[PDB]
Ligand binder design. Structure first.
Ligand SMILES: OC[C@H]1O[C@@](CO)(OC[C@H]2O[C@@](CO)(OC[C@H]3O[C@@](CO)(OC[C@H]4O[C@@](CO[C@]5(CO)O[C@H](CO)[C@@H](O)[C@@H]5O)(OC[C@H]5O[C@@](CO)(OC[C@H]6O[C@](O)(CO)[C@@H](O)[C@@H]6O)[C@@H](O)[C@@H]5O)[C@@H](O)[C@@H]4O)[C@@H](O)[C@@H]3O)[C@@H](O)[C@@H]2O)[C@@H](O)[C@@H]1O
Ligand SMILES: OC[C@H]1O[C@@](CO)(OC[C@@]2(OC[C@H]3O[C@@](CO)(OC[C@H]4O[C@](O)(CO)[C@@H](O)[C@@H]4O)[C@@H](O)[C@@H]3O)O[C@H](CO)[C@@H](O)[C@@H]2O)[C@@H](O)[C@@H]1O
Ligand SMILES: CCCCCCCCOCCOCCOCCOCCO
Ligand SMILES: CCCCCCCCOCCOCCOCCOCCO
Ligand SMILES: CCCCCCCCOCCOCCOCCOCCO
Ligand SMILES: [Cl-]
Ligand SMILES: [Mg+2]
Ligand SMILES: [Mg+2]
Lengths: 921, 555, 99, 50
């Protein structure tokens, strides 16, 4: 669309990040499009376009070669993409589908230009290194902090029933001082577990290796065209025993018959990926386990806590036991189309899309036994299978005309969609040989379970779109859809979504021609609506499930319907029944997102200064909300209601300067910046008290930002008994403890003294791509910043306290070595205690930090061997290069951790340093 | 256009209309039992032990005061917030059990009795369950919502209130449920998980026994002891009703807490935990999964207090040391003791659930607190480590039944209401207390040789049948309830029936600070801490229809 | 009154790889193909299935393993083989009349 | 490039078979017909009640 808000991505920049997932290589490149990703080797990522659209699903929609799919991108071969445009407003998005409410991304893959036969072999290798690693007490440091904690509370530090003994006394002033410290050699009496100074993060990390190869080949005839690529990725993540890889093939082709009036074409890609994923919570386990626990126990078993040591698993052993939990994923994606043009301007076209993946995996349960961390002797295997089969069908009629100065596209069409999913798995316990070779369900001698279910939905869509241009200077555009979904009853099946966009090519009107210095200026405005139906396939219904209770729980609460009504104690099948999962709602309808947008493109000084501004107001109404039930309603009282509304408004700015220089240096900058506000407008009563989208179940998020949080205000530290007795009554308050603010001024510090203390929305984010060519060399940098963001740190709970955790004696951050005491009175860090008397675990400003950052996302330096040398080996282009991703991080002095982009326990974001090449005949 | 968007339909479920069919009526009934086994978790056991840490019987246990911080707050009466996750949790879970009762009743109401002859016994079963939950919510929160309209639409739940009824008539609406159950249940249940008519009587009685100590004022103090209510406790613990169902005290105390002896004469109604039964790891008592000692790796919750330990001490004639018991620790060599101590509290140097091969010590290997919470283990819910009944899922749990009403409870509840109705039947209530006390004195099977191997001096004797004063008789029943029901999570609930909570527990806080240092800053605030606050999120969603309990600020 | 369902899955994954060198010549009346080459083959199979008994509604819509109230069984195993091959083939024609 | 469909309801009731088929083959002659790349590929989905 020339009338909508459309960010057009320079695809040649993408391949310079060596990223597997291309979407991950747009991180920061598009204003309005926030792309988030941890460091896991898939390169899987999360996209949010223009704030937070709705209260169910905010993921965008891809149209790859005219086929809609809502998820993957790291599952396909990023390397055979030709073009990517991101459609941000509703006028441009809507015509592409009924799932457009969160923006849409149009991807077209490479074809073959006519009369041309090229080939392209790109290849690359990288080392991947853990960078921002968290500083964590060592065995000696552990013993110092412990003595401090004991002593502050005034207990005998020799009473730590771990291995420590302390030689300590009192200085002249009377405060306690530690002189020397001895450690036992074994953590248990029976000497099965030696004392270590293990650095656990070093132990579970490794130098990753990335590989990448891609071949592509194309051919162009007057009568047709054809394309063929093969690709491979492989990435051993920096966390040990985690890896990812992908094999890719793509064939596209088209055929022009009769008189280029019957046209047949096909796009198709085939992919096989496979991965072993990092377990849930290894980073936290690595943070948690004390240095004193050795990797290996006396006998060569895995090391583990014993005696008084905390209830924490051995993180190396976890990763090793999970190394064969590999899934294998085959996805087939493509379409075939026919195009008829029965006379000038008239086109009929019909496309059938197919999107089909299947995922296989055995997940193994080996028996573990790290000290007191035991599993009994359980061994099991689960063979799991899943299929996702989506197909799409549409027919399209379009007319074009050009009357002197009038222009005009019309198009009406129809589209059908259908997904059908199935999944099932067989589970078996008890194996004699504990290897993946033996551990198949046929070979278990214990109990079995079988699992699985299906589901699906269908969509129907009728649409038309009308473009008009007057004299190539005034443009009007009109979109209109009627959209039905199987997820609603007949009485609300369909919904109708119009869109209107206007465009005013200012400069082509004569009274601007008196300006040599501005080549185009175009003001555009748009209004339009998009439906949203992205909800549970079962959303309409009252759901009873048999749920006999065959399934792993945690600490009980399986909520099963089986019961030994007879009192036999079991041994055989019990009688069972049904339990409510969900209350239905006869009158769920389409949720509606309405967007108004205005913006201006511009080009100055002979195409050298270009860019565009964007302003939008984006509102979601009748929002489809999974709404909790009132408490007394009980089991499965939730229901999907249209009940809720949310705004997003903001500005988006692209600006690129390009020009060469008279000593041989081309330089091309294009940066971008954007900002937005998000507000929840209305919300069901029970979701407001819920906290589900906001204020912690103490205040209602209505009127604040999605995910805003409420808490106590920490006002420094009581530094003198004076300051406690003069403060409001605060349970557990003493010298060295956090002073919490008395917000209501009632003279008591209690649950009423909390306030809006957290907002996830930045003041603004921005990106910037510097490019230089000089003497066959080239240099790229990409910088990305987010400015003004609050983060909530849960590491700070582990770094700044001895007892802000559920369990005593865990490993702690290295900052608490600086904790306030009489000894050391120049500190923000609360004094070490052994009991959270003051409940400094309560949500509070203490954990909100400034998570602003600027990151050198990428820097690449290339040499391309000059033509005359290379052409003589028959190579249009030969280029070597070398690059590094996420090389450098600038952050706030007030951020106390390592990665402000990944402040807690997600898969660390490594620094990559890469070498590679480009050959093309 | 039309046929296309209807083809795919919900897979693997029964839909709302379908569920009402008669073919599913007994499915719903079973499902309403199941949730008492499958609806609690390690912090919400429908035994309510996690909340009897408030009592003088026990400490919360665990790693330390943060291991379930909200329950330490409960244990010391300080820093309880109405926004606390456990308080919400248990409120929510108990009303979930109520759902399954009412859904079954909604189905059962429409059934034709000519063609479903047990229609009213099933209906009674469900109404028994519904009273079970309401009863426990009433103990927990005082000001509860009464949800007993099984044909009530979802939306009508939004306009309910926890003050629709006065406190007394809240109690009566519970009594109504257990009454209908009495009128309708059969005398005997061949399927032992189903309550028999005596169970309905016993719970009926228990409901009037809690109703009779009235709090009709605006706070929680006693406003007089009603004797129409007390006279019901008599009616419905009549030994003639109990014999029609065959209930009575086991010939040895330990049987109520042993896998081999499930569903005995004393087990009036129990939760039927089971193993090897088609479920992932079994319908085990996961709710007690925290209270296994360190011998199993985790987690050392629910540890008894030295207070309770010393309570089993007896004078030289085998009677409780009413005034002196807590002034010196129980000492094996030189003190006379009640056999029930060794069925309730596993103590250092002594066997863990009657197994000479597991002797408890003040060790890493038994307690987790480095001494903070002591070195005692809760015996009633744990089992022999060798037991067939014991499995580890995510926690260690067994298939040992949780008994909601022991027949000892029925005798001591009769004893109580008689003593409170000063009406000449006190020498009967004494003779009830001696039924339990004499049974207990002889419960030395499985610990018969503790005299010669460890030195214990068992000495317990019944009270002489005199014409006791009512004040002195009360303290003899109370003392029997101390030793008989120790660690069974009704001790603190007893004190709030008696209006004695602040006195006895604030006192406990000072006597026990010496042994468990957590009670240092503990303080019970009367007309406040006798009941958990109604959950904040619950009030806040009600839009002013719910009312908070007395003593708590307008939040 | 037995009712059950078995959800069954099987995969067969075979791949082949070869490299081939061939020479041709035509000397007046002599003809001649030569060829040497190498070939690798590998099959890997897997199959598994979950079995569940006892269903309240007896249709394919209901009869998924998650919804059974009776006994379960799990089945499956893998297997495979590989082949290596070295070969050459030599064609000769004399005067287009003797081969 | 081909697309194909079969469907056959056998003469024994409640037995049927069908097949969907796609095939793409292609080759490319580069340099001087001295570097040649090619590809054959067929994709099929069948389903049956026996
Ligand atoms: O801040 C309050 C906040 O917490 C929530 C959510 O956790 O609580 C409500 C909700 O939580 C549950 C269960 O999820 O109870 C949690 C609660 O139970 C307590 C007592 O109240 O007791 C827990 C005890 O269990 C242990 C056992 O750990 C075991 C031993 O077998 O060892 C391994 C490793 O820990 C476990 O897999 C085994 O079960 O702890 C379990 C407990 O510990 C936590 C702490 O984060 O998990 C440790 C994990 O974190 C890692 O660091 C990274 O994943 C790993 O090392 C490890 O897997 C917590 O997540 C687990 O629940 C033992 O330590 C304890 O003695 C409390 O200690 C605990 O807080 C429900 O019952 C309850 O309803 C929120 O809703 C609320 O806002
Ligand atoms: O019908 C299943 C339903 O479950 C989801 C998540 O609720 O995925 C199931 C499952 O897959 C997740 C992993 O698989 C990968 C591999 O490509 O991605 C699959 C797609 O799922 C997304 O998350 C949806 O956007 C998307 O990222 C992928 O296209 C990995 O990236 C994922 O980690 O999740 C389970 C683990 O939690 C696992 O057992 C399943 O395979 C939905 O995606 C799906 O609709
Ligand atoms: C070049 C790719 C073109 C793909 C379109 C042609 C189809 C080739 O085989 C795909 C078959 O899948 C069709 C959808 O599946 C039909 C199943 O529906 C009946 C059972 O639910
Ligand atoms: C377009 C380029 C946008 C540049 C924004 C720079 C933001 O800097 C914030 C500095 O605060 C410290
Ligand atoms: C592209 C030019 C921007 C250069 C300076 C940006 C600084 C980015 O760091 C963000 C942290 O600022 C927060 C202040 O710390 C307190
Ligand atoms: Cl329904
Ligand atoms: Mg205040
Ligand atoms: Mg049992």
């Amino acid at each position: 669309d020339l009338t909508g808000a459309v960010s057009v991505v320079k695809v040649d920049e993408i391949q310079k990040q060596g990223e597997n997932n291309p979407v991950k290589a747009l991180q920061g490149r598009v204003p309005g499009m926030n792309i988030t990703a941890d460091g896991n080797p898939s390169g899987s990522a999360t996209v949010r376009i223009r704030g937070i659209g709705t209260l169910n699903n905010n993921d965008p929609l891809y149209i790859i070669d005219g086929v809609p799919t809502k998820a993957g991108m790291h599952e396909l071969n990023g390397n055979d993409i030709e073009s990517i445009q991101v459609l941000k407003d509703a006028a441009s998005a809507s015509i592409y589908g009924s799932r457009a409410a969160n923006g849409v991304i149009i991807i077209t893959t490479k074809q073959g230009k006519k009369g041309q036969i090229k080939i392209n072999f790109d290849a690359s290798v990288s080392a991947s290194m853990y960078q921002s690693k968290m500083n964590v007490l060592n065995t000696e440091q552990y013993g110092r902090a412990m003595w401090q904690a004991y002593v502050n509370d005034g207990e005998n530090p020799n009473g730590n029933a771990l291995g420590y003994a302390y030689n300590w006394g009192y200085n002249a002033d009377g405060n306690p001082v530690l002189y020397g410290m001895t450690l036992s050699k074994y953590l248990d009496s029976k000497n099965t577990m030696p004392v270590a100074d293990t650095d656990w993060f070093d132990e579970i990390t490794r130098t990753g290796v990335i590989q990448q190869y891609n071949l592509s080949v194309s051919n162009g005839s007057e009568k047709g065209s054809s394309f063929f690529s093969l690709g491979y990725y492989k990435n051993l993540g920096v966390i040990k025993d985690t890896d990812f890889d992908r094999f890719s093939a793509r064939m596209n082709s088209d055929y022009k018959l009769i008189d280029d009036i019957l046209t047949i074409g096909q796009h198709f890609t085939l992919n096989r990926t496979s991965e072993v994923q990092a377990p849930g919570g290894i980073i936290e386990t690595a943070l948690d386990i004390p240095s004193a626990i050795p990797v290996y126990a006396s006998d060569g078993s895995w090391g583990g806590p014993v005696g008084g040591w905390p209830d924490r698993r051995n993180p190396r052993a976890v990763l090793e036991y999970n190394k064969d939990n590999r899934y294998t994923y085959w996805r087939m994606f493509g379409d075939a189309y026919v195009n008829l043009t029965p006379f000038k301007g008239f086109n009929l076209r019909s496309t059938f899309g197919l999107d089909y993946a299947n995922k296989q995996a055995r997940y193994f349960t080996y028996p573990y036994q790290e000290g007191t961390q035991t599993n009994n002797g359980k061994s099991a295997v689960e063979a799991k299978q899943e299929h996702w089969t989506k197909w799409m069908w549409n027919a399209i009629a379009t007319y074009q005309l050009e009357v002197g100065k009038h222009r005009g596209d019309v198009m009406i069409g129809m589209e059908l969609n259908r997904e059908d999913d199935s999944h099932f798995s067989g589970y078996k316990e008890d194996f004699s040989i504990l290897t993946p070779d033996y551990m198949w369900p046929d070979a278990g001698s214990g109990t079995a379970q079988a699992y699985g279910a299906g589901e699906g939905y269908s969509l129907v869509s009728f649409f038309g779109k009308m473009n008009y241009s007057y004299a190539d200077r005034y443009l009007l555009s009109l979109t209109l859809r009627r959209d039905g979904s199987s997820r609603f009853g007949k009485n609300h099946r369909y919904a109708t979504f119009p869109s209107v966009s206007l465009g005013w090519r200012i400069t082509q009107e004569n009274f601007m021609k008196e300006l040599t210095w501005l080549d185009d200026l175009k003001l555009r405005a748009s209004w339009g609506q998009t439906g949203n139906q992205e909800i549970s396939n079962l959303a309409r219904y009252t759901i009873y499930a048999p749920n006999y209770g065959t399934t792993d729980s945690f600490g009980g609460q399986s909520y099963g319907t089986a019961y030994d009504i007879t009192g036999s104690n079991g041994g055989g099948v019990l009688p069972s029944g049904f339990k409510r999962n969900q209350i239905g709602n006869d009158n769920i309808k389409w949720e509606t997102t309405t967007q108004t947008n205005v913006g201006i493109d511009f080009s100055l000084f002979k195409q050298s200064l270009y860019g565009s501004l964007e302003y939008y107001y984006k509102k979601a109404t009748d929002i489809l909300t999974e709404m909790a039930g009132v408490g007394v309603l009980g089991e499965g009282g939730s229901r999907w209601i249209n009940s809720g509304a949310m705004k997003n408004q903001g500005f988006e700015f692209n600006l690129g300067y390009r020009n060469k220089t008279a000593f041989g240096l081309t330089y091309d900058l294009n940066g971008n910046i954007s900002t937005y506000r998000n507000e929840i407008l209305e919300l069901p009563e029970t979701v407001a008290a819920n906290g589900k989208f906001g204020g912690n179940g103490v205040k209602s998020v209505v009127g604040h930002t999605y995910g805003a949080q409420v808490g106590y205000i920490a006002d420094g530290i009581f530094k003198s008994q004076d300051e406690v007795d003069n403060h409001a009554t605060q349970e557990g308050a003493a010298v060295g403890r956090i002073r919490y603010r008395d917000i209501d001024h009632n003279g008591v510090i209690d649950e009423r003294d909390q306030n809006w203390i957290y907002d996830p929305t930045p003041s603004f984010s921005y990106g910037l791509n510097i490019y230089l060519e000089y003497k066959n060399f080239d240099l790229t940098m990409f910088w990305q910043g987010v400015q003004g963001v609050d983060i909530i740190s849960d590491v700070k709970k582990k770094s700044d306290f001895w007892s802000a955790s559920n369990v005593g004696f865990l490993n702690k951050g290295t900052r608490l070595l600086n904790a306030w005491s009489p000894t050391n009175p120049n500190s923000d860090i609360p004094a070490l205690t052994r009991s959270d008397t003051n409940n400094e675990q309560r949500v509070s400003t203490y954990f909100v930090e400034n998570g602003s950052f600027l990151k050198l996302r990428n820097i690449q330096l290339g040499y391309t061997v000059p033509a005359v040398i290379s052409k003589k080996m028959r190579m249009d282009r030969l280029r070597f290069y070398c690059s590094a991703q996420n090389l450098l991080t600038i952050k706030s002095k007030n951020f106390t951790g390592e990665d402000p982009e990944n402040p807690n326990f997600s898969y660390p974001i490594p620094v990559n340093i890469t070498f590679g090449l480009n050959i093309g005949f | 256009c039309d046929d296309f968007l209807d083809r795919q339909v919900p897979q693997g479920i029964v839909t709302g209309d379908q569920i009402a069919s008669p073919e599913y009526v007994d499915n719903l009934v079973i499902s309403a039992y199941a949730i008492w086994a499958t609806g609690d978790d390690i912090n919400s056991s429908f035994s309510l032990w996690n909340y009897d840490v408030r009592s003088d019987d026990c400490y919360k246990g665990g790693s330390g005061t943060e291991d379930g911080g909200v329950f330490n707050a409960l244990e010391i009466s300080k820093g309880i917030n109405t926004t606390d996750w456990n308080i919400n949790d248990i409120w929510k879970r108990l009303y979930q059990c109520i759902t399954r009762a009412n859904t079954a009743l909604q189905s059962l109401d429409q059934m034709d009795e000519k063609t479903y002859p047990l229609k009213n016994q099933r209906i009674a079963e469900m109404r028994f369950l519904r009273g079970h939950a309401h009863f426990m919510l009433k103990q927990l929160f005082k000001k509860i919502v009464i949800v007993n309209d099984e044909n009530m639409e979802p939306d009508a739940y939004n306009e309910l209130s926890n003050t629709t009824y006065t406190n007394d008539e809240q109690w009566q609406k519970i009594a109504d449920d257990f009454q209908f159950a009495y009128d309708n249940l059969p005398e005997v249940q061949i399927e032992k998980g189903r309550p028999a008519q005596a169970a309905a009587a016993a719970y009926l009685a228990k409901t009037y026994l809690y109703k009779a100590y009235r709090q009709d004022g605006a706070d929680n103090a006693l406003t007089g002891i009603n004797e129409e209510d007390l006279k019901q406790v008599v009616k419905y613990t009549d030994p003639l009703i109990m014999a029609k169902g065959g209930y009575g005290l086991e010939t040895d105390y330990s049987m109520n807490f042993l896998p081999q002896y499930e569903n005995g004469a004393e087990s009036v109604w129990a939760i039927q935990y089971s193993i090897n039964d088609g479920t992932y790891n079994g319908n085990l008592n996961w709710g007690m999964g925290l209270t296994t000692p360190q011998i199993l790796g985790c987690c050392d919750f629910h540890k008894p207090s030295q207070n309770l330990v010393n309570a089993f001490k007896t004078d030289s004639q085998g009677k409780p040391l009413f005034s002196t018991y807590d002034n010196e620790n129980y000492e094996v060599a030189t003190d006379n003791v009640d056999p029930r101590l060794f069925h309730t509290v596993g103590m250092p140097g002594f066997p863990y659930k009657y197994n000479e091969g597991y002797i408890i010590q003040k060790n890493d290997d038994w307690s987790r607190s480095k001494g903070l919470y002591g070195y005692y283990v809760s015996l009633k819910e744990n089992v022999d480590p060798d037991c067939d009944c014991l499995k580890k899922g995510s926690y260690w749990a067994s298939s040992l039944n949780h008994i909601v009403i022991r027949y000892a409870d029925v005798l001591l509840m009769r004893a109580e209401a008689l003593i409170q109705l000063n009406d000449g039947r006190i020498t009967d209530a004494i003779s009830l207390i001696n039924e339990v006390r004499s049974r207990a004195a002889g419960s030395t099977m499985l610990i018969f040789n503790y005299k010669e191997d460890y030195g214990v001096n068992f000495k317990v004797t019944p009270y002489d049948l005199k014409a006791y004063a009512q004040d002195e008789a009360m303290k003899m029943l109370k003392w029997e309830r101390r030793v008989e029901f120790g660690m069974e999570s009704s001790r603190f609930f007893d004190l709030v029936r008696w209006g004695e909570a602040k006195d006895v527990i604030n006192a406990y806080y000072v006597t026990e600070a010496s042994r468990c240092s957590i009670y240092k800053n503990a303080g019970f605030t009367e007309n406040k801490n006798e009941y958990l606050p109604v959950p904040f999120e619950q009030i806040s969603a009600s839009n002013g229809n719910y009312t908070q309990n007395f003593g708590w600020a307008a939040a």
